[PDB]
From Swiss-Prot, chain B:
<feature type="binding site">
    <location>
        <position position="280"/>
    </location>
    <ligand>
        <name>L-arginine</name>
    </ligand>
</feature>
<comment type="function">
    <text>Produces nitric oxide (NO) which is a messenger molecule with diverse functions throughout the body. In the brain and peripheral nervous system, NO displays many properties of a neurotransmitter. Inhibitory transmitter for non-adrenergic and non-cholinergic nerves in the colorectum. Probably has nitrosylase activity and mediates cysteine S-nitrosylation of cytoplasmic target proteins such SRR. Inhibitory transmitter for non-adrenergic and non-cholinergic nerves in the colorectum.</text>
</comment>
<feature type="binding site">
    <location>
        <position position="171"/>
    </location>
    <ligand>
        <name>L-arginine</name>
    </ligand>
</feature>
<feature type="binding site">
    <location>
        <position position="285"/>
    </location>
    <ligand>
        <name>L-arginine</name>
    </ligand>
</feature>
<comment type="subunit">
    <text>Homodimer. Interacts with DLG4 (via N-terminal tandem pair of PDZ domains); the interaction possibly being prevented by the association between NOS1 and CAPON. Forms a ternary complex with CAPON and RASD1. Forms a ternary complex with CAPON and SYN1. Interacts with ZDHHC23. Interacts with NOSIP; which may impair its synaptic location. Interacts with HTR4. Interacts with SLC6A4. Interacts with VAC14.</text>
</comment>
<feature type="binding site">
    <location>
        <position position="399"/>
    </location>
    <ligand>
        <name>heme b</name>
    </ligand>
</feature>
<feature type="binding site">
    <location>
        <position position="281"/>
    </location>
    <ligand>
        <name>L-arginine</name>
    </ligand>
</feature>
<comment type="similarity">
    <text>Belongs to the NOS family.</text>
</comment>
<feature type="binding site">
    <location>
        <position position="36"/>
    </location>
    <ligand>
        <name>(6R)-L-erythro-5,6,7,8-tetrahydrobiopterin</name>
    </ligand>
</feature>
<feature type="binding site">
    <location>
        <position position="371"/>
    </location>
    <ligand>
        <name>(6R)-L-erythro-5,6,7,8-tetrahydrobiopterin</name>
    </ligand>
</feature>
<feature type="binding site" description="axial binding residue">
    <location>
        <position position="108"/>
    </location>
    <ligand>
        <name>heme b</name>
    </ligand>
</feature>
<feature type="binding site">
    <location>
        <position position="384"/>
    </location>
    <ligand>
        <name>(6R)-L-erythro-5,6,7,8-tetrahydrobiopterin</name>
    </ligand>
</feature>
<protein>
    <recommendedName>
        <fullName>Nitric oxide synthase 1</fullName>
    </recommendedName>
</protein>
<feature type="binding site">
    <location>
        <position position="370"/>
    </location>
    <ligand>
        <name>(6R)-L-erythro-5,6,7,8-tetrahydrobiopterin</name>
    </ligand>
</feature>
Amino acid sequence: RFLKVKNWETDVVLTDTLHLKSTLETGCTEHICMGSIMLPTKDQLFPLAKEFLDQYYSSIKRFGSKAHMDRLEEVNKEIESTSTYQLKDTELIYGAKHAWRNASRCVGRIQWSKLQVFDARDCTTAHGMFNYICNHVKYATNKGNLRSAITIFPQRTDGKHDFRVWNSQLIRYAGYKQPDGSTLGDPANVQFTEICIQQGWKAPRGRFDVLPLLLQANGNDPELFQIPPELVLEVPIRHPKFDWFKDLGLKWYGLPAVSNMLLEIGGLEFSACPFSGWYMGTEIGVRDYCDNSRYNILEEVAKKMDLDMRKTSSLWKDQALVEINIAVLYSFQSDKVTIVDHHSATESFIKHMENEYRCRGGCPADWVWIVPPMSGSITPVFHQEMLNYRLTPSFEYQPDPWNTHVW
Amino acid sequence: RFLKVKNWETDVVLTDTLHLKSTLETGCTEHICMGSIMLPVRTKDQLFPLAKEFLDQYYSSIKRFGSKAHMDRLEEVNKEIESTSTYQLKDTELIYGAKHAWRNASRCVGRIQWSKLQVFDARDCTTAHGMFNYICNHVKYATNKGNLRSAITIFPQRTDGKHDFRVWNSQLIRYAGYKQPDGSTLGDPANVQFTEICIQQGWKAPRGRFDVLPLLLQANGNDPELFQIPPELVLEVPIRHPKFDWFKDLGLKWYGLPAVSNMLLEIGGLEFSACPFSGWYMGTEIGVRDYCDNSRYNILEEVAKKMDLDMRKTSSLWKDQALVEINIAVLYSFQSDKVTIVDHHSATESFIKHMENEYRCRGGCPADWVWIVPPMSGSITPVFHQEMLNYRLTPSFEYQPDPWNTHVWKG
Ligand code: HEM
Ligand code: HEM
Ligand SMILES: Cc1cc(N)nc(CCc2cc(CN)cc(CCc3cc(C)cc(N)n3)c2)c1
Ligand SMILES: Cc1cc(N)nc(CCc2cc(CN)cc(CCc3cc(C)cc(N)n3)c2)c1
Ligand SMILES: C[C@H](O)[C@H](O)[C@H]1CNc2nc(N)[nH]c(=O)c2N1
Ligand SMILES: C[C@H](O)[C@H](O)[C@H]1CNc2nc(N)[nH]c(=O)c2N1
Ligand SMILES: [Cl-]
Ligand SMILES: [Cl-]
Ligand SMILES: [Cl-]
Ligand SMILES: [Cl-]
Ligand SMILES: [Zn+2]
Ligand SMILES: [Zn+2]
Ligand SMILES: [Zn+2]
C-alpha cells in the first residue's frame, strides 16, 4: 500500500507508491513466495483501453481534456461496433516504450525512452514479415553501434489469425543431437532446429549455424526464410592475455533480439513484436557459454589454464568463469560492437531506479533477474531491496506456437 | 494442492505438498512479491493450538501419534497453560524443536546438517554471569580445536516480555568497528553502533582492526553486563594466498566460528529470545561479504592494486578477478590450519541433494533463492537454476528488534 525499500550498502530508503497501480498477478500469496519460479470480450476490453488511454493522456498532460474524452468516446464506439480498436501511432509508440519501462526483469531500462519503434501493422504475409525483420536487424545492428528497436506486427483478432515469429530470438544457433549422444551447437535450440529440418531447412550441421526464421502471418502455417548472412554481425572470441583462447573456435552474435513474447497495450495483444537492445557481457560468457545445458565450456577452458581441477575449493571454476567473461567483453570492444559489462549496467540501473522512484513513485524489479549471474554482491543491485509487481503495457510470455498451431 | 518446481539445468520436476503445513505470512500478496525484502506477550487463547500442533508433529515424528503418551502430554500441557499461562517443554521436545527450526530455515544453504546439532539446554540459567559461562562452553565445544561442531544454546523462554534473556551481540564472535573523527572507520563498519554501546557500558577498547568484541548479556530483563570471551577460546585464521606471497601482508584474519546470537527461536508457541547457534563458514561469507562489501572491510581495491590489474575500466573485470583471489585465499588458509570450512560449490551441491531428499521424505523444502544462491559465481552453482518455494514452517528462527531499541533501563 505504501512501501519502503532499503539499500543495505548505502542505507538509502525509498518509498514506492507506483505499486498501487499494479494490475496483473504475481503468483505469490501470503502463504508462499514464488519469486524464483520462471513462469509463476467487449466487456473486458473497454476497461483495459480506458486504463491505457487515461495514462497516455495523463503523460501528455491533457488528462480530462476534450481530446482525452473524444478519444475515449471514439475507442468505445469502435469496440462496440468492431469488438476491437486500432491504436494511434502516438499511442503505439508510448505503449511499446512503457512495456519496456515496466519490464521488471530488465536491467537495461535506463534506456527505455530511446526505443525506435517500427510499425509493421500493415504487414500481411510471411514474406512481408521477413522484409520488416531484416530491416530491424540492419537498423539495430548499425555496423556495431547498436540501437534499441522493436517491430510490431498486426494485433491478435479472433485468435485464429495470430502473427508469430516461431524463433525465440531473431538470431540464434542450431543444436543437433548426435549418434554419439552429445549435442552439437546450442543444446537450447535442439527442438526448434528439428521443426526447421521438418519444415525443409537444409541444416549445415555445424556448431554455430544461424537458424532460419520461421514466420507465421495471419494464422497461416509458418514459412522459412534465411536472414542475409551479411546482416548477421558476429564476433570471434579471443582473450587479451591468453593467445590459446582463440583456438576454442568460439564466436557469438552481436544482436540480442527476443522474438517470442507478447506485447499487451490497452487490452490489445501483439503476438509478434520482436525487440532488441545490446548484450550485457555475462549473458554470453556466463549463461550462453557456461551453463551445463548450454555450450558448457568451463571444463575445457580450465584445462587450457592448467588449474588444479581436482577439488572445487581451488575455485578453478570461478577462475575460468572470470576469464571467459573478460574474453567476451574484450572481443566485442575490439570489434567496436556495443556491449555493457555487469558493473556498469547495474550501476546504471541503480541510477535509473532512483529517477523512477523520484519522478514516477517506483520501479518494479525482479531481484532474481536483475542481479547478474556472477559476482552478484560486488554489484550495487545485490544490496538493493526491490519490489516486483506487474504494470501494463507489458511484455508477457506466451506458449510456443507449435503446441498451439493447427496445420 | 500440489505445487511443482523445475530445475532449468536438468529439467527435473519436484512436487511440493509441505507448503500446505505453512501457517505464518510471507510479506507477498497476489499483487506484490517481497522476495528481496530483508525484513518483511502471547495469550492462553493463541497458545494451546500452537502447542497442540507442535506436539502433534513431535508425536508423529516419533511414530506415537494418538498414543496414550501423546494424549497425556496434550492434557498435561493444556492444564499447565490454563493454570500458569505457559508451559515447559520436555528435553526431547526442545531438541526436536531446535533441530526443526534449523530444518525449516529457508535462508540456510547448510541444512543437510540439520539432524546433527548439539543442543545445550540452558533453561536453568538465571544470571548474566550464568549466560557467560554457558556461552564460553558452547564456543569451546563448537570450536573443538578447528574440527567445528554445530551447536545451539537455549536460555529460558519469554514469560511476560519484561524478563527476556537476550544476547545483545548479533554474533558471539565479531570484530569491533570504530568511527573516526575524519569519517573513516577502523575495524568492521557493521559493528560500529554495538561497539559504541560496549564502550558506553565500560569496555576498554584496544582500537585495532580486529578486536574481538565483549559479550553483552541480559538475563531476566535486567540491564545487560559485559564479559570478555577468554582469548584462548577464540580460534582465528590469518589469511594468506597459496601463490601470492604479499597477501599475508594485507594483515587479514578471521574467526573460525560463525555463531548467530540475535534471533528468536519459536517452538510450540514458546519464545526463546536468547538462543545462540553456530555451524561453520561457507568461504564466501568471509571472502565475498565480510571482506568485499563496500560497507564492510572493503578490500577489493587494495587487493587489485597489489595484483596490478587494470583498474581504469570496470570492463577489465578487475573486481571479479580480485574477488576470486581473496576467496581462494580464505579457503586455502582455513584448510591449511585445519579449521572446517566449505566452498560454495560443495555447499550448494550438498543442498540440492538435501532438497531432493526432503521433497521425497517430507513433501518439500522451503528455500529462499535470494539467500541460497551464493554472492559470487551464482549461475555456475547448481542452486541458481533451481526453482524454489519460500514459505514459513514452525518451529522457526525469527528476527527480533535489537534490544537497545526496546530495553527498559533499570539504571
Ligand atoms: C539496451 C540494451 C539492453 C540491455 C543491456 C538489456 C539487459 C537485459 C538483461 C541482462 C536481461 C535478463 C537476461 C539474463 O541476464 O538472463 C533482460 C531481460 C529482459 N529485457 Fe532487457 N536489455 C536491453 C534492452 C531491452 C529492450 C530494448 C527491451 C524491450 C523493448 C527489453 C525487455 C526485456 C524483457 C521483456 C526481459 C525479460 C526476458 C524474459 O523474461 O524472458 N530489454 N534485458
Ligand atoms: C553447519 C554449517 C552451516 C553452514 C555452512 C551454513 C551456511 C549458511 C549461510 C551461507 C547462510 C546465509 C548467510 C549469508 O551468506 O548471509 C546461512 C543463514 C542461516 N542459517 Fe545456516 N549454516 C550452517 C549452520 C546453521 C545452524 C546450525 C543453524 C541453526 C541451528 C543455521 C540457521 C541459519 C539461519 C536461521 C539463517 C538466516 C540468518 C538470517 O536470516 O539472518 N545455520 N547459513
Ligand atoms: C532485448 C534484450 C537485450 C538483452 N541484452 N538481453 C535480453 C534477454 C535475452 C534472453 C535470452 C535467453 C536465452 N539465452 C532467454 C531469455 C528468456 C526467455 C525464456 C525462455 C525459457 C525457456 C524460459 C523463460 N522463463 N524465459 C531472454 C533481451
Ligand atoms: C549458523 C551460521 C553458519 C554460517 N556459516 N553462516 C551463518 C549466517 C551468518 C550471518 C552473518 C551476518 C554478518 N556478516 C549477517 C547475517 C544475516 C543477519 C542480518 C544482517 C543484516 C545486515 C540484515 C538482516 N536483516 N539480517 C548472517 C550462520
Ligand atoms: C536486498 C537483498 O534482499 C539483500 O541485499 C540480501 C540479498 N541476499 C543476501 N543473501 C545472503 N546470504 N545474505 C544477505 O545479507 C543478503 N542480502
Ligand atoms: C530458478 C530461477 O528462477 C532461474 O534459474 C532463473 C534465475 N535467474 C535468472 N536471471 C536471469 N537474468 N535470467 C535467467 O534465465 C534466470 N534464471
Ligand atoms: Cl542470449
Ligand atoms: Cl539461465
Ligand atoms: Cl560473517
Ligand atoms: Cl550482505
Ligand atoms: Zn543459466
Ligand atoms: Zn513473492
Ligand atoms: Zn553483502
